[PDB]
Design a protein around this ligand. Sequence first.
Ligand code: T4K
Ligand code: T4K
Ligand code: CL
Ligand code: CL
Ligand code: CL
Ligand code: CL
Ligand code: NA
Ligand code: NA
Lengths: 351, 351
Amino acid sequence: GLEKLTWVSEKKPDWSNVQKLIAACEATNQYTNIGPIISQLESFIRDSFLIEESKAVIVTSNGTSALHALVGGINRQLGRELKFVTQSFTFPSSNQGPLKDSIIVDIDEDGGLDLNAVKNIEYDGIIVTNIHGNVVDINKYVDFCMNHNKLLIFDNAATGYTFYLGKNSCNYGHASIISFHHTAPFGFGEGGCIIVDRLYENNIRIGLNFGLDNSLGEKSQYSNQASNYRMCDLNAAFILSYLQNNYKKIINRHSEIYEIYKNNLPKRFKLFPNHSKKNPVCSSICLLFDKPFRLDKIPFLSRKYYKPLDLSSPVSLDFYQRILCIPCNIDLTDRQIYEIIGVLNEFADKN
Amino acid sequence: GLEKLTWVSEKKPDWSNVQKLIAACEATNQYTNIGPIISQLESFIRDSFLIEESKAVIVTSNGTSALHALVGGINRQLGRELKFVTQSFTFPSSNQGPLKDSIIVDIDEDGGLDLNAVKNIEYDGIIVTNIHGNVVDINKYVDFCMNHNKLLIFDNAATGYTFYLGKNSCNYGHASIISFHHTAPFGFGEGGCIIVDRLYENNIRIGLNFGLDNSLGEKSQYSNQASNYRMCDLNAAFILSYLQNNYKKIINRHSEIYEIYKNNLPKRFKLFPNHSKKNPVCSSICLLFDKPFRLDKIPFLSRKYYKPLDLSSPVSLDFYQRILCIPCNIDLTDRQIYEIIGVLNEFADKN
Ligand SMILES: Cc1ncc(COP(=O)(O)O)c(/C=N/[C@H]2[C@H](O)[C@@H](O)[C@@H](OP(=O)(O)OP(=O)(O)OC[C@H]3O[C@@H](n4cc(C)c(=O)[nH]c4=O)C[C@@H]3O)O[C@@H]2C)c1O
Ligand SMILES: Cc1ncc(COP(=O)(O)O)c(/C=N/[C@H]2[C@H](O)[C@@H](O)[C@@H](OP(=O)(O)OP(=O)(O)OC[C@H]3O[C@@H](n4cc(C)c(=O)[nH]c4=O)C[C@@H]3O)O[C@@H]2C)c1O
Ligand SMILES: [Cl-]
Ligand SMILES: [Cl-]
Ligand SMILES: [Cl-]
Ligand SMILES: [Cl-]
Ligand code: NA
Ligand code: NA
């Protein structure tokens, strides 16, 4: 039964839909450098994920490039290489590229960057990871960055449709990023998106194109803070088509999977910390066992995220050692979920 | 007849062929993190472009990420952020990402980084741009870097199939990069490739995946010098298909178009400096006028590359003021070439 578990739902192109979209590229020979699909996908993300008009929606090559293009654009606007703090319990993206020298501090027990740990640090902003669709106490972080006059970026790579006080979590802070990597619920191949205050929109958009702005003609000027961060229209067509066919079913079905775990917790596990009133839409079901344990004890497909970036982050290491990330996708039957919960109950009695 | 000039030939997916290649992805749900297409495109590039076995062929998301992945891999291998010199007369890529603090020096009149400008300064390596399919005197750079114990990278973004003393220019220096951007002769959408000494292959390839090596399980370690730099298998399929169908015709027709300009040079125009014995395979036909002039004087689709990264570099600036980059692609007719040449004679008579 559980032998057939996969991390990601089986994802195949709607070839007729993808070919219809790319027929726009074929007619003009424009397949990149902001061809005719980019605005269709940015529009679809705004209207489907419910991004406020105060935010630009900016697609990039991947979730990593979304975060990097966001920072390089803000670096260009403020005129220096900004110093960000990130949490140890997250993916490498937030200590790479323009963040390669980001400061790493521990999480608190709610899964986000420990605000008590930056007391005595020099920094311009913080990056907080909303883990696998779960969200932190977002207003704790908004209030803190308002009071201390800091930039706030939410790493929502795995968190495209978790609502906080009646609005997509992507709408909070100065910006968020989401991943359309194949392993993400909304993903297909590679891609990313920046949700950012309009203040920074132009510098981030031209920052996808080496900092060059064709609208300036001979005044067009590259920035050493920019790169090739743009989304290819080919990738936009595959992502847009996947979202068109699947995004509603993913939200409802992922919410249904979360409901079953919430009402049938195996003994001595807890749900990863989450601060949304409705079920989050998760990239995996993350449970914390009450004691450290090794994945090879679990006789079904399962993972640990995230290996701490700084292995001297004690709260981050504890979570890593105690966490069990279970597949969450639209291919999973309830029968499989109940068979999973029974294997975990067994494990809990013998460990 | 010059109304219908395009920079790039009309490029259209061979959909039955692309569908056939991506069927391997559909069968396993693996569309990135090195799916079943990556090895196929890497092999084709090795066998078709005639790369030697002492070189890795490593595809990436774009030409920029090929350069940045190359530098990040080497930085991580040597345990230090290496200092590169780049030429002013190049694209912004070689002053971005891990090269954002690269030293910019002038070209000499042969079109490459002026070695006299790095006699008395600190640096680990040089990046030399082979402009639009033209190649520098490659052995003077190989000899200099061997004598001074310096790394040598060729920015071959626009230069996939120009031969130097019997082998693809990509096989010289410690590494080269090529672009599969839609604007490149070999390109389709977005893509890049690294041709590099085997010594650096493993650090560069894991460096496309945040520095992570799955084969090491728990000792898998991210690097602050890495990123998401991989090519998605979707992109690999479009590029591999375009190359299967067109690469031979592009090589022959681009060489024939060059032959016509070389035997019918317009008045007071010289070919861009080139050191290949056979006609180079050009991304555009670059001519130097005998004095500065404006593009708005040329009554057909034409460009100037490259706006100097450092506007104070005198040879780079002189080149930019005198250069005319004429479309070179497999849609161009001989009729159109002789018309362009007639227009440039008329331009010379009046300027
Ligand atoms: C908080 C955060 N911020 C930023 C980012 C950066 O976003 P991107 O630049 O990646 O868009 C991430 C990435 N988060 C993602 C990564 O994107 C992904 O590589 C995977 O990191 P790995 O676990 O190292 O990948 P891999 O082991 O290859 O795949 C996991 C499972 O998915 C399966 N899979 C994978 C791919 C690529 C596929 O095409 N099909 C498929 O079935 C295989 C396996 O069972 O998951 C992370 C959580 C992130 O979690
Ligand atoms: C020396 C060197 N190193 C590194 C790189 C970096 O490689 P990538 O990361 O780009 O793969 C480049 C790129 N060199 C290329 C760039 O790839 C391209 O953006 C274009 O830089 P722009 O001139 O700023 O782009 P754009 O004006 O949009 O395109 C030029 C012409 O191509 C036409 N076009 C363009 C696209 C994107 C398309 O899809 N279809 C099409 O017909 C329109 C126009 O007439 O040309 C450069 C020489 C380079 O020349
Ligand atoms: Cl809420
Ligand atoms: Cl679909
Ligand atoms: Cl084709
Ligand atoms: Cl030769
Ligand atoms: Na927008
Ligand atoms: Na706001």
